[PDB]
């Protein structure tokens with residue numbers, strides 16, 4: 001739908017792994033009236049990254065929800081090379097950076113508003129049988145002070161029709177400090193591993209992204225910080241099997257930490273559902289108000 005000749009590059013907004021998002025102005029009339037959009041592209045347009053990207057685009061296009069970034073279209077050149085995904089531009093950027101920047105202005109009730117919106121977005125994913133696999137505040141975007149959206153689906157997979165998990169280990173770096181144990185040991189991803197990662201997201205939020213308190217920093221201090229490469233993963237696994245966990249963040253109430261710890265259950269089937277997480281968060285919100 002979008003012609004590349006009319007996409008005006010403005011700046012880079014974010015970089016992932018093998019991909020990036022740019023702020024552009026779509027201005028077909030060439031009079032500086034076009035709307036600003038976010039444009040995702042591959043940084044290395046190989047076959048498997050390209051088919052993965054096409055599947056990611058199809059996934060995003062099939063999602064329509066208040067807390068999921070809006071698909072707008074695609075843009076390609078030259079036959080079909082340099083495929084680009086056009087999305088709505090959300091003016092406050094990632095929740096990670098936004099929270100770190102406005103920590104003094106954002107109270108617990110607002111954190112729980114965001115938490116509730118993330119849970120509702122994730123529940124919608126689950127109704128489509130999609131596994132996000134990369135839930136983290138760096139992949140949540142801020143539309144305004146009252147609304148966040150899941151903002152990236154580059155690792156999202158669809159469950160087999162006959163199974164409740166998806167096994168995949170692809171080369172590169174993996175956000176292992178957000179991974180459920182069964183994802184570390186067996187590469188198994190499920191709604192329940194998304195729930196584990198959501199618990200880490202809740203931890204992130206209540207740390208206010210204070211950067212000695214990041215999951216990587218805390219876990220590395222727990223496993224020993226002389227650890228080596230692959231050994232890290234091994235030690236992390238051992239840590240989680242002995243019920244080592246991220247600590248309660250400064251100022252975090254006990255009941256919120258308990259939501260976290262319930263999401264961090266070694267037993268995959270004992271983790272709460274996203275609907276129950278939303279109910280509990282919303283009840284605490286109501287109590288606070």
Ligand SMILES: N#CC[C@H](C1CCCC1)n1cc(-c2nc(Nc3ccc(C4CCNCC4)cc3)nc3[nH]ccc23)cn1
Pocket residue numbers: 013014015016017019020021038040069087088089090091092093094138139140141150151152154
């Ligand atoms: N998620 C997610 C992560 C993803 C990575 C890129 C590819 C995979 C991982 N990534 C998506 C966006 C993104 N950013 C915006 N806006 C935005 C962003 C930054 C600012 C800063 C605010 C103030 N300081 C100066 C600039 C302002 C606005 N809008 C978007 N729409 C769709 C995506 C998207 C950014 N990183």
